[PDB]
């Protein structure tokens, strides 16, 4: 069961050289060569590092890839940063054959000053118990680079019944906006005692606690 | 100039057999592999099938129950067989080029355009417009979000309004989720100042061409 992880999101500024990863998790990634593919929003996926060092005639040789058997994880380098290598990077490794890859990674240029988000929590309103529904509602704006992950808890527990998170569009200010639900009953919302949505931005976190 | 080009219908029902055949322009299979690729919705590529100019095939072993891949060197294609489709199968299929030795593909230089193959049996539905009441209370920033949540509509798209577009500060549109039972949903709040809430009137005005549902909801500070 050998599968493919990349780094939601990786902040850094054009001018310095950025790293990408991708870890194996069951096998090791010596036994095939690794592939990097960068996805620009709205393009297939075209080949950036290729035989584990080389590049495609055409592409500059600052994309540099490298393989580390020591933890079994991959590198996608970025010498000269540029603000035109906002794509989607993805990996490759072999499974007996298996095209798999990972999960994405996105890459941002950072021509902004790096902004906190603000998280606002609305619990189901009074509303949708006659209709036997129940959702909890996260929002989360202003903020930069827009890529953050949301793990909904249950009585301080994990939980991913209903977990529908889509990519955050472009605001009037250039900023981000977040979308993460969780689709319930209104058996479980009257069920537990602590409801919260989290997003990890970056490396620091903002939560709040909405309770019925 | 290698070309690659795939197609099929696009729209399947569970417990279906899913065929697809991708043609190749410009070339043989002679020595050069072809691979199936899908891209299931939010995350990365994977493969099903393989197979050459003779007939071997390689297969993915989760989905090797399910996969049939088949060459027809007479007019230069190759085929996708996707028996017992369920809902976790939604992706666009790509077929890409290979060249390589002893099974395993050592170069990928072209891919295809990739088709969109839909698994799902949700009917056409109105959407179930949810007003979301914040705490009404001024918080360490002097904001208040009110809005309307937008559930179980089938399918795309559905656009929200405020105050038939009277508010434009704080409203922002978003773009769809999916529910695994077949159906969708949306979001819209308006970030109104903390001093001009409680007394000011903001409603959300909800449009689902596809079901012809307009509705029009009330949203209240607290209770």
């Known amino acids: 069961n050998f599968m493919l992880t990349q780094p939601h999101s990786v902040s850094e500024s054009p001018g310095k050289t950025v790293t990408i990863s991708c870890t194996g998790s069951?096998?090791?990634?010596?036994?095939?060569?690794v592939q990097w593919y960068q996805q620009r929003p709205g393009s297939a996926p075209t080949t950036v590092i290729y035989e584990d060092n080389q590049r495609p005639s055409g592409v500059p040789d600052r994309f540099s890839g490298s393989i580390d058997s020591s933890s079994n994880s991959a590198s996608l380098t970025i010498s000269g940063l540029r603000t035109e290598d906002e794509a989607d990077y993805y990996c490759?490794?072999?499974?007996?054959?298996?095209?798999?890859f990972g999960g994405g990674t996105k890459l941002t240029v950072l021509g902004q000053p790096k902004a906190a988000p603000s998280v606002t929590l609305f619990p189901p309103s009074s509303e949708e118990l006659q209709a036997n529904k129940a959702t909890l509602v996260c929002l989360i704006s202003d903020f930069y680079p827009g890529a953050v992950t949301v793990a909904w808890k249950a009585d301080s527990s994990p939980v991913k019944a209903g977990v529908e998170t889509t990519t955050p569009s472009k605001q009037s200010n250039n900023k981000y906006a977040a979308s993460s639900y969780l689709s319930l009953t209104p058996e479980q919302w009257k069920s537990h005692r602590s409801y919260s949505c989290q997003v990890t931005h970056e490396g620091s976190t903002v939560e709040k606690t909405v309770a019925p | 100039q290698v070309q690659l080009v795939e197609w099929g219908a696009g729209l399947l029902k569970p417990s279906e057999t899913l065929s697809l055949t991708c043609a190749v322009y410009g070339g043989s299979f002679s020595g050069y592999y072809w691979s199936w690729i899908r891209q299931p919705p939010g995350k990365g590529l994977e493969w099903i099938g393989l197979?050459?100019?003779?007939?071997?095939?390689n297969y993915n072993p989760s989905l090797k129950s399910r996969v049939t891949i088949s060459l027809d060197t007479s007019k230069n294609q190759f085929s996708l067989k996707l028996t017992s489709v369920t809902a976790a199968d939604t992706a666009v299929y790509y077929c890409?080029?290979?060249?390589?030795?002893?099974?395993?593909?050592?170069?990928?230089?072209?891919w295809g355009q990739g088709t969109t193959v839909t698994v799902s049996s949700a009917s056409t539905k109105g959407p179930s417009v949810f007003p979301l009441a914040p705490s009404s209370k001024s918080t360490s920033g002097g904001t208040a979000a009110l809005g309307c949540l937008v559930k179980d509509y089938f399918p795309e798209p559905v656009t929200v309004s405020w105050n038939s577009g009277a508010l434009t500060s704080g409203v922002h549109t978003f773009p769809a989720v999916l529910q695994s039972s077949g159906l969708y949903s949306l979001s819209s709040v308006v970030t109104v100042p903390s001093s001009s809430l409680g007394t000011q009137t903001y409603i959300c005005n909800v449009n689902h061409k596809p079901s012809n549902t307009k509705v029009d909801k009330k949203v209240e500070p607290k209770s």
């Open positions: 069951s096998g090791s990634i010596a036994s095939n060569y």
């Open positions: 490759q490794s072999y499974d007996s054959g298996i095209w798999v």
């Open positions: 890409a080029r290979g060249l390589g030795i002893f099974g395993v593909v050592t170069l990928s230089d072209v």
């Open positions: 197979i050459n100019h003779s007939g071997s095939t």
